Each structure stands twice: as structure tokens, then as C-alpha cells.
Amino acid sequence: NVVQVRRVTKVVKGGKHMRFRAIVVVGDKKGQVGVGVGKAKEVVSAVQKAAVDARRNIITVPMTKYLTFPHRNEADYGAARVMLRPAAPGTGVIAGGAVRTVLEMAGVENALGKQLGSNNALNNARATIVAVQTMRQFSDVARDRGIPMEELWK
RNA sequence: UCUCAUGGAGAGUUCGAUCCUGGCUCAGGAUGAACGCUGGCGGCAUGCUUAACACAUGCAAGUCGGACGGGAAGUGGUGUUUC
Ligand SMILES: [Mg+2]
Ligand SMILES: [Mg+2]
Ligand SMILES: [Mg+2]
Ligand SMILES: [Mg+2]
Ligand SMILES: [Mg+2]
Ligand SMILES: [Mg+2]
Ligand SMILES: [Mg+2]
Ligand SMILES: [Mg+2]
Ligand SMILES: [Mg+2]
Ligand SMILES: [Mg+2]
Ligand SMILES: [Mg+2]
Ligand SMILES: [Mg+2]
Ligand SMILES: [Mg+2]
Ligand SMILES: [Mg+2]
Ligand SMILES: [Mg+2]
Numbered sequence A: 001n002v003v004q005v006r007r008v009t010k011v012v013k014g015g016k017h018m019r020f021r022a023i024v025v026v027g028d029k030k031g032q033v034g035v036g037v038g039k040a041k042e043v044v045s046a047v048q049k050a051a052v053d054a055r056r057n058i059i060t061v062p063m064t065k066y067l068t069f070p071h072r073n074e075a076d077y078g079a080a081r082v083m084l085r086p087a088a089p090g091t092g093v094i095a096g097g098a099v100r101t102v103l104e105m106a107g108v109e110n111a112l113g114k115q116l117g118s119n120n121a122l123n124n125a126r127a128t129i130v131a132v133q134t135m136r137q138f139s140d141v142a143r144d145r146g147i148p149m150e151e152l153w154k
Numbered sequence B: 001u002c003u004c005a006u007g008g009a010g011a012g013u014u015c016g017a018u019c020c021u022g023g024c025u026c027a028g029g030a031u032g033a034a035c036g037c038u039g040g041c042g043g044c045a046u047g048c049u050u051a052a053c054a055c056a057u058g059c060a061a062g063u064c065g066g067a068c069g070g071g072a073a074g075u076g077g078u079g080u081u082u083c
Helices: A043-057 A097-106 A121-134 A138-145 A149-153
Strands: A002-011 A016-027 A032-040 A073-077 A080-086 A111-117
Touching: A002 A043, A002 A097, A002 A121, A016 A043, A016 A097, A016 A121, A032 A043, A032 A097, A032 A121, A073 A121, A080 A097, A080 A121, A097 A111, A097 A121, A111 A121, A138 A149
Parallel strands: none
Antiparallel strands: A002 A016, A016 A032, A073 A080, A080 A111
16 A cells, blocks of 8 residues: 655756655555555656565554454654554544554554654654554463463453 | 443645754634525524614503592492492
């Protein structure tokens, strides 16, 4: 999914040397997602490079039986800060462009999110990845703390 | 994987491009609203925000004859009853 297409410029003695930068995320909508960034002379080629760079950068988002987040989380990348919190089933995904495409492509069905701090697409994507990467699923906190699930449930 | 949550979306604009700090602007709701164009019906509401500025006319607080003396309508008369 192509998030953003921009025309960046290098300048040479001749004139303006034009390129396209594409920010693109890939997902299966099944709980596997990644971000990637690419650069080329043509829209198509940059799209493609972005595709590959993403595929080799990819990770997995912890999910809950209802297709949502384990818990509430913040994240920080550059000047982009990102706020995610779990939702009740049937609320859909409500968020802004970068965060929303990332989460939607991960396959998260119900999520609250707001990017605070900056607006830049790319950074917000990476921040979202940082968020959902640090998410701890309950089985694993049970295993870490060394305490049975039902005891933390209460 | 019980319980809680029914809730927080962005976009454009400084640069040859970038990231940022930063303002301006937009998308939403609400009117005791006004104006433009258009306008079939019903249900429930609402209707001088400004000049506590002037007011023509008509009506918005009276009743009690079982507190009381009279007089005035009739009636034949203080037997009747009204104002
Ligand atoms: Mg190279
Ligand atoms: Mg900071
Ligand atoms: Mg914001
Ligand atoms: Mg400047
Ligand atoms: Mg310019
Ligand atoms: Mg700011
Ligand atoms: Mg409006
Ligand atoms: Mg008319
Ligand atoms: Mg008034
Ligand atoms: Mg008068
Ligand atoms: Mg009257
Ligand atoms: Mg009487
Ligand atoms: Mg009387
Ligand atoms: Mg009496
Ligand atoms: Mg008498």
C-alpha cells in the first residue's frame, strides 16, 4: 500500500534533478506488517524498491482474540509521538494517515490512535512500529514475572 | 485470554529539496439566529438579543345585601324580587 509519493530534488549545475520518494507499507492483514522507503526516477520503480526494503524490515504485531491491542501504549521516533489504545469490538480503526495505514495493513481491527507531536508520514509509521513492537502479550508477562495467568487477570 | 472499556483521525501552507520550531487556514457540532434561492403535508416546540426609547385605543382585581343605613326598578303596594 503506497502511503506517500513526493518529489524530492537534488540540484546540479544543469538544473533540477528530479526524483520520487515513496513511503510504502506491506501487510498480509493477518498480523504481519512492515514499513519501507524508496527512491527512484519513476513512480513505479521507487514503489518497487520501497516494497523490497519493507519486506526485509518486517515484524509482527501482538493481537488479541478480538483483533486489537494487548494494552495502551506510547511511542517515540524523532518528533513523532504515537498513542495507541485498545478498543471494544465493532469500533473499527480510527486514526490518521500513517498510523491508520500501518495498523490497517497489520490487520488490527479495532484500535484507537492519535499521533501527537509531528505530522510527518514516515516518522509516524516508524513510531507505530516501535509502539506495536514493545507490546507485551499476557502469556509472556505471566512467564516473565513467574506468575500464573489467572492471578494477573484479577 | 477472564474483566474493563463504546472514546482522542487529520489536511494544505515558509524550502531547490529535507527534518524541525512555529503561526494562519479547513474538515465537525450548536444556534432565541439573519440573508439568498427554493418550497406539499402533518406532530411537538419556539418567536424585540437592539432603545429599562416613546406610547393613540380597548381590556388585565375585585368581590360580600347573610356587617349597615338609605334610594331605584318593577309589583299592587314592605307578600315577591332584583340591581
Ligand atoms: Mg544508492
Ligand atoms: Mg520530545
Ligand atoms: Mg494533531
Ligand atoms: Mg526561512
Ligand atoms: Mg515553493
Ligand atoms: Mg506546532
Ligand atoms: Mg459547519
Ligand atoms: Mg418566499
Ligand atoms: Mg430586552
Ligand atoms: Mg390609554
Ligand atoms: Mg373582562
Ligand atoms: Mg341575594
Ligand atoms: Mg349579588
Ligand atoms: Mg358575612
Ligand atoms: Mg323581602
